[PDB]
Amino acid sequence: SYYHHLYFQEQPLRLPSPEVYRFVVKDSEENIVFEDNLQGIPIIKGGTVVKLIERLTYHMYADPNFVRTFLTTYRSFCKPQELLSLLIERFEIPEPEPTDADKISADLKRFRKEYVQPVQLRILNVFRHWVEHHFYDFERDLELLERLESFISSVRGKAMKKWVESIAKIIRRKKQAITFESPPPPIEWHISKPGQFETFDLMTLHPIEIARQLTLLESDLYRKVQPSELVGSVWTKEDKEINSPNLLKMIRHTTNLTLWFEKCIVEAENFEERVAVLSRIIEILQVFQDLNNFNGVLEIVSAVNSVSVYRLDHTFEALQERKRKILDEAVELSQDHFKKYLVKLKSINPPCVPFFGIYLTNILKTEEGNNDFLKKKGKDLINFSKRRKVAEITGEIQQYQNQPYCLRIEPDMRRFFENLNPMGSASEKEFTDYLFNKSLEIEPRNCKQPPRFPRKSTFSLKSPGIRPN
Ligand SMILES: C[C@H]1CN(c2nc(Nc3ccc(O)cc3)nc3ccccc23)CCCN1
């Protein structure tokens, strides 16, 4: 009564009624649309969530690319509990009502072999991919895992036991949860010595080791970001702390470090000390560059572009020309929408830390420039092509996440950079206003030379340089 729709048309497969199994409703413009201008598997443009689930577990062929993109992006259109219920509903396939003749027929044998078993195995593959690559869904919702484990314990049949045991094995391993191929260089120390963590500061630590330790820290933060933290702009929305925890740590580290570089410059009231502070920051930038940490490079560029720093003409003119040329070459990476940076990224060799902000910007642009739904007369369809476009960008982020640095962690220095709090008790607005007022104090408008302020420390301003020892 219901049927599934090259050089010969074979007999149609008989299916159960949609009244008892939602997924066999005929495809139409009102429930699924394909990228027909794009090219063996048809590319899904959008559909109802029921049709997306049907195609996620399609009986005719496997679709690994859709499975991957779906499981990365589905939270922007479907809740995890809802997804599990839909997959279970998909699994529990009723057989077509036997005709007066059946009351095993050839049609029913076809149905179990061509439809039921393939769809059920597709679902088990989706479960496997789900727990393998998105197990945080199950850490975040213990009931979701209980439902899944209970369901797979109900799956009968020798043919499916190996899939069930493969899923259970992954769950087992997930619930349970540094070597060097060549010797990392010795940790570098300047004025602050090992263990003296209360004296740690921008000018007392070694500029080489500041850049190394910030690079190890930023590499770790970058590596831990999952693509679903970026989908649907969830890191800016209500539940951001639950849905984007690693992304937020990355963003907040960058905010704090950029403000700290600004603070170090503007609070150096003594002119010669401030020029030495800026010069040291440029040396840290150089080492970031040597390490291919372009996140760190552009954090420093961002800091010197802050108004309170940028307006310090006397400080930039007092820089050695050699320091000026290094700074300005890095600033030019960012110009014309990061043209030169993007050329450099495509050519570098690992390990590296890419500039994270450009991905965030491109995802926000894509989220804003595409509608979540395709508009229909009846129920509007989920715009899946939008999610694919976002997944393309998150796929780029992941290329650089398995690239460890041959550098030794310094635990005290790592804690120092994890605990930076340049704002004190000020709000961001208060702190920004404070920095600008301090800028005005240390280089007043139209001063022909900066006023004299006392030196802040009694140490040499001389850098140890960026040659490793
Ligand atoms: C004279 C500038 C001062 N300045 C900067 N100068 C330079 N380079 C520079 C070239 C020639 C020179 O004689 C001295 C410095 N690089 C920067 C990089 C990041 C932020 C600001 C600046 C800030 C205001 C613009 N006017």
Side-chain angles (χ1 to χ4, degrees):
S1 302
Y2 288 85
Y3 301 96
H4 178 257
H5 296 237
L6 232 314
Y7 305 112
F8 175 80
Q9 276 176 127
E10 306 177 339
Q11 182 195 68
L13 187 67
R14 191 158 86 94
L15 301 175
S17 161
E19 281 59 74
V20 299
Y21 188 66
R22 284 201 286 175
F23 301 91
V24 294
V25 172
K26 185 180 178 295
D27 289 352
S28 82
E29 301 291 312
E30 319 312 317
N31 56 35
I32 185 166
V33 297
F34 301 88
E35 297 284 10
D36 296 302
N37 192 37
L38 288 189
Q39 231 173 347
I41 295 173
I43 300 158
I44 291 164
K45 183 181 170 196
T48 66
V49 73
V50 160
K51 278 291 168 188
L52 299 178
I53 293 290
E54 189 208 345
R55 288 286 172 158
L56 187 65
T57 52
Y58 202 53
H59 71 284
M60 310 208 83
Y61 46 73
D63 199 348
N65 290 336
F66 184 58
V67 172
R68 182 190 339 100
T69 302
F70 185 100
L71 281 174
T72 290
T73 61
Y74 80 85
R75 300 158 198 83
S76 64
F77 56 80
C78 176
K79 292 264 192 69
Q81 291 278 335
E82 181 185 358
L83 170 59
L84 179 55
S85 291
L86 280 159
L87 288 167
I88 291 176
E89 176 187 7
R90 182 84 169 121
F91 196 96
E92 299 186 331
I93 303 166
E95 296 183 347
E97 230 61 65
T99 58
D100 357 77
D102 310 347
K103 297 197 159 140
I104 286 148
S105 80
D107 285 2
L108 183 55
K109 184 181 180 168
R110 255 195 94 181
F111 182 71
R112 298 174 173 177
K113 191 170 167 309
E114 296 184 28
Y115 193 88
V116 178
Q117 185 166 278
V119 168
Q120 287 182 342
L121 298 173
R122 304 280 187 235
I123 292 157
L124 295 179
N125 178 69
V126 170
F127 286 156
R128 183 181 66 175
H129 190 102
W130 191 358
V131 295
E132 180 66 56
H133 298 288
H134 308 275
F135 193 71
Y136 51 79
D137 282 341
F138 301 96
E139 307 171 328
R140 288 167 192 176
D141 184 0
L142 299 190
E143 191 195 347
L144 189 71
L145 184 55
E146 282 168 353
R147 290 184 65 207
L148 172 62
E149 297 186 317
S150 174
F151 177 74
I152 64 184
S153 296
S154 80
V155 169
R156 293 290 81 99
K158 272 179 158 74
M160 306 213 270
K161 286 175 184 181
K162 53 187 113 66
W163 281 99
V164 169
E165 289 177 335
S166 173
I167 295 166
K169 180 172 186 152
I170 292 168
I171 294 171
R172 244 199 316 284
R173 155 167 45 87
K174 297 277 185 195
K175 268 180 186 147
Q176 268 236 281
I178 290 160
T179 75
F180 298 100
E181 183 265 337
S182 50
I187 307 306
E188 297 276 346
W189 295 99
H190 179 34
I191 293 172
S192 291
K193 293 312 183 181
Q196 306 175 348
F197 66 94
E198 309 87 2
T199 81
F200 285 12
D201 207 352
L202 174 76
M203 296 292 272
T204 54
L205 286 166
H206 201 293
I208 298 179
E209 209 55 54
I210 289 167
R212 289 168 173 179
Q213 295 302 319
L214 281 168
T215 295
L216 292 168
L217 173 49
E218 293 175 2
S219 167
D220 285 346
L221 296 176
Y222 181 92
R223 172 183 51 84
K224 293 178 176 183
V225 176
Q226 300 304 308
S228 68
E229 305 185 45
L230 297 137
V231 174
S233 294
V234 281
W235 77 93
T236 68
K237 301 188 174 191
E238 183 176 307
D239 301 318
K240 58 174 77 82
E241 307 292 339
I242 294 295
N243 288 329
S244 309
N246 305 290
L247 176 52
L248 286 171
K249 291 198 46 160
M250 183 76 169
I251 294 165
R252 287 161 179 168
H253 165 82
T254 289
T255 296
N256 268 312
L257 195 64
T258 299
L259 281 175
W260 180 71
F261 285 129
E262 297 166 37
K263 185 183 172 169
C264 289
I265 295 170
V266 175
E267 291 193 336
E269 297 179 7
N270 176 268
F271 183 44
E272 290 71 30
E273 183 177 297
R274 184 167 67 253
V275 174
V277 166
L278 179 54
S279 305
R280 198 69 59 91
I281 291 173
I282 292 160
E283 291 176 352
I284 292 162
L285 182 153
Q286 293 184 264
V287 178
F288 278 154
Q289 278 240 42
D290 297 337
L291 289 169
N292 288 329
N293 178 3
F294 292 104
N295 190 83
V297 169
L298 277 324
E299 286 171 336
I300 285 171
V301 174
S302 187
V304 297
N305 282 343
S306 66
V307 185
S308 68
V309 171
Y310 192 82
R311 68 167 296 278
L312 299 175
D313 289 316
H314 298 288
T315 299
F316 287 97
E317 295 282 4
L319 288 176
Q320 283 174 312
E321 203 171 321
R322 72 194 69 175
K323 247 68 178 178
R324 195 204 300 168
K325 298 207 118 71
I326 290 151
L327 176 59
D328 287 345
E329 175 137 278
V331 168
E332 286 157 21
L333 295 173
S334 62
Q335 295 172 349
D336 305 317
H337 310 290
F338 297 90
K339 188 192 177 71
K340 286 173 172 174
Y341 162 70
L342 291 175
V343 169
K344 213 154 266 281
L345 178 64
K346 99 194 270 261
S347 74
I348 41 70
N349 286 315
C352 68
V353 190
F355 175 50
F356 206 68
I358 180 153
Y359 299 118
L360 298 172
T361 289
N362 287 338
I363 291 167
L364 287 172
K365 279 186 184 170
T366 309
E367 290 287 342
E368 254 274 345
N370 301 263
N371 204 283
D372 278 340
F373 294 93
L374 310 171
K375 311 182 229 98
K376 294 301 184 196
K377 170 162 200 179
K379 191 160 56 204
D380 288 345
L381 313 184
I382 297 159
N383 180 356
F384 190 80
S385 284
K386 176 181 186 177
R387 275 65 174 201
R388 178 180 299 109
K389 300 174 181 181
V390 170
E392 305 272 353
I393 301 174
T394 64
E396 297 196 1
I397 293 179
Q398 294 188 284
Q399 305 175 15
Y400 303 99
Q401 289 181 316
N402 311 336
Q403 309 182 356
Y405 278 85
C406 187
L407 300 174
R408 192 169 302 277
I409 291 172
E410 214 296 316
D412 287 331
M413 297 186 58
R414 170 73 151 256
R415 281 186 282 278
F416 175 80
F417 290 115
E418 292 180 327
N419 293 327
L420 289 182
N421 180 45
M423 296 197 233
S425 290
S427 69
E428 197 163 39
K429 181 48 166 169
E430 283 170 344
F431 188 62
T432 291
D433 292 356
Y434 157 79
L435 294 178
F436 189 70
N437 289 331
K438 182 59 68 171
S439 182
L440 289 179
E441 181 184 6
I442 62 179
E443 282 184 29
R445 254 143 200 155
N446 307 124
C447 67
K448 305 261 169 228
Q449 87 199 29
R452 182 182 87 211
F453 295 89
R455 205 73 72 68
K456 208 67 227 241
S457 93
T458 64
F459 300 125
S460 176
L461 303 177
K462 213 159 278 144
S463 172
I466 59 176
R467 188 186 190 183
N469 288 258

